[PDB]
């Protein structure tokens, strides 16, 4: 059982120190591997759209999830960013500046989209929501 | 109409017994729900907690039965819990209301600090267990409210508890064991021997002994 002695302060403190590493949440923050992620601890990131791609939805669903391969400007890492809403892929062109954000599960895949943990928030400095609702238009043409 | 089949049913039908506390004092089983409707009937208030379908695998398919959890209470120290399984939702509810009345218990209430006003919280720390669920109730000061989840909170309101602190351990999502564990600690409020119960017991004749002549005569 537990050590109970009044003079056992060191053992109890050191035991907990070792055992906190067994906790996945604790180890994910104190390992230091978060800095090696594409965002490197940031909430958002800008990147350049390399190509427009489609990803087969995971089973038992059946669809083609419209994504976009993006290279991050600050570190040059390539990621797959899901483009939400209906027909918003038409608002994205290759070699375009897009603001990326997490998908909502802190680096974990979401939904039936396989191996996708990012989504597109802005394109050419304009939010996809504004373009989807016809609030604004992309700055070109 | 009601034709009592038990001695208690006759005395309550006659009117000799006029309070549930007279039955609780002698720990007599109550087997007719009309007794509860005759003593605290108008003050009671039922409430269906949940409808739970349960299934039994069979050769042809799966037999689905419905399980209804019903809580009754006057909000003044009496609460009851009844669970019945039936093939129809309406039949389960009606039978669950009957079972809840038959299990009504007295709930002891006390004071957190000074004894000012009417009792508002549990008199001591009390815990109840059912399955893996354990519910704890700690006396709380007036105005603190019922600090509990929805299932215990509904039961505590019907019991007349106004302010209590609660904590839970185990699978509280198992509503059957959560409500039963809550009901389990409420009946233990009268089992804990406080110093104010140290006074020696003064026994009184049971209703069956006091009214033997009325019970001896057959009822027609």
């Amino acid at each position: 059982g537990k050590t109970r002695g009044m003079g056992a302060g060191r053992k109890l403190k050191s035991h907990r120190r070792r055992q906190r590493w067994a906790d996945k949440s604790y180890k994910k923050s104190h390992l230091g591997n978060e800095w090696k992620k594409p965002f490197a601890g940031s909430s958002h990131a800008k990147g350049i759209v390399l190509e427009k791609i489609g990803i087969e939805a995971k089973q038992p669903n059946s669809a083609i999830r419209k994504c976009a391969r993006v290279q991050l400007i600050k570190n040059g890492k390539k990621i797959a960013a899901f483009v939400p809403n209906d027909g918003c892929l038409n608002y994205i062109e290759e070699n375009d500046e897009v603001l990326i954000a997490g998908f909502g599960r802190k680096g974990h895949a979401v939904g039936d989209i396989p191996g996708v943990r990012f989504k597109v928030v802005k394109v050419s400095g304009v939010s996809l929501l504004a373009l989807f609702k016809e609030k604004k238009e992309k700055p070109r043409s | 109409k009601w034709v009592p089949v038990t001695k208690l049913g006759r005395l309550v039908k006659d009117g000799k017994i006029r309070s549930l506390e007279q039955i609780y004092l002698h720990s007599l089983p109550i087997k007719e729900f009309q007794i509860i409707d005759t003593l605290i009937g108008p003050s009671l208030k039922d409430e269906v907690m949940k409808i739970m379908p349960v299934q039994k695998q069979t050769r042809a398919g799966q037999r689905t039965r419905f399980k209804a959890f019903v809580v009754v209470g006057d909000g003044n120290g009496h609460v009851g819990l009844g669970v019945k399984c039936s093939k129809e939702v309406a039949t389960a509810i009606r039978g669950g209301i009957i079972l809840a009345k038959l299990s009504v218990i007295p709930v002891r209430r006390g004071y957190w600090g000074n004894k000012i006003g009417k009792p508002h919280t549990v008199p001591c720390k009390v815990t109840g267990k059912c399955g893996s669920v354990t519910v704890r109730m700690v006396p709380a000061p007036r105005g603190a409210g019922i600090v509990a989840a929805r299932v215990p909170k509904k039961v505590l309101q019907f019991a007349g508890i106004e302010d209590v602190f609660t904590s839970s351990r185990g699978s509280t999502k198992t509503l059957g064991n959560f409500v039963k564990a809550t009901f389990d600690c409420l009946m233990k409020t009268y089992g804990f021997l406080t110093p104010d119960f140290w006074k020696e017991t003064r026994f009184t004749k049971s209703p069956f002994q006091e009214y033997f002549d009325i019970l001896a005569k057959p009822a027609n």
Binding site: - | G113, I116, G117, P141, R142, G143
Partner: protein, 184 residues
């Protein structure tokens, strides 16, 4: 350094932990409509204020009744509740502070008292009168419906001297209508 950085400020309400509890939504809308509140925020800050008062009382009640801090701050808390009409001289104990409710504080609002003293037709009529500079508490005009009136000030609630309802000249609607009638 900027001196303005040392100015204090704080929060006056907390949002509920469970946002879609049907029972709570029913009880809160009843108080909001009964007292003509603007939104749930006005009810939540009163609950926030009440929680602070009750918390102070509980700490005092946990101390020995001979503790000097219990005696000094307990008297101050009771004196504060009496001065606003929440408690009565017959309820001079900390245990009665723990029995206060939200309705007690909402009844001391200027909006509630303007309505329950006959100056307004409805709780919603009082709201508009207060914000339209028609009420005064003593000599001072008050245009804040949440103004918590004191017992010593409840008898001085009257219409402002500059209001059409308190001896002042008629507003710009009657004056223009009078002007139009004269032109005819």
């Amino acid at each position: 350094v900027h001196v303005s950085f040392y100015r204090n400020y704080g929060k006056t309400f907390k949002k509920p932990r469970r946002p879609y509890e049907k029972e709570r939504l029913d009880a809160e809308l009843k108080l909001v409509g009964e007292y003509g509140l603007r939104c749930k925020r006005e009810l939540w800050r009163v609950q926030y204020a009440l929680s602070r008062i009750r918390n102070a009382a509980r700490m005092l009640l946990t101390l020995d009744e001979k503790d000097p801090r219990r005696i000094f701050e307990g008297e101050a808390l009771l004196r504060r509740m009496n001065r606003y009409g929440l408690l009565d001289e017959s309820q001079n104990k900390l245990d009665y502070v723990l029995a206060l409710t939200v309705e007690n504080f909402l009844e001391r609002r200027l909006q509630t008292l303007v309505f329950k003293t006959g100056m307004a037709k409805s709780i919603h009529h009082a709201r508009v009168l207060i914000r339209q500079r028609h009420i005064r508490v003593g000599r001072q005009v008050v245009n804040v419906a949440s103004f918590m009136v004191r017992v010593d000030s409840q008898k001085h609630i009257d219409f402002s001297l500059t209001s059409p309802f308190g001896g002042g000249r008629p507003g710009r609607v009657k004056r223009k209508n009078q002007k139009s009638a004269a032109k005819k």
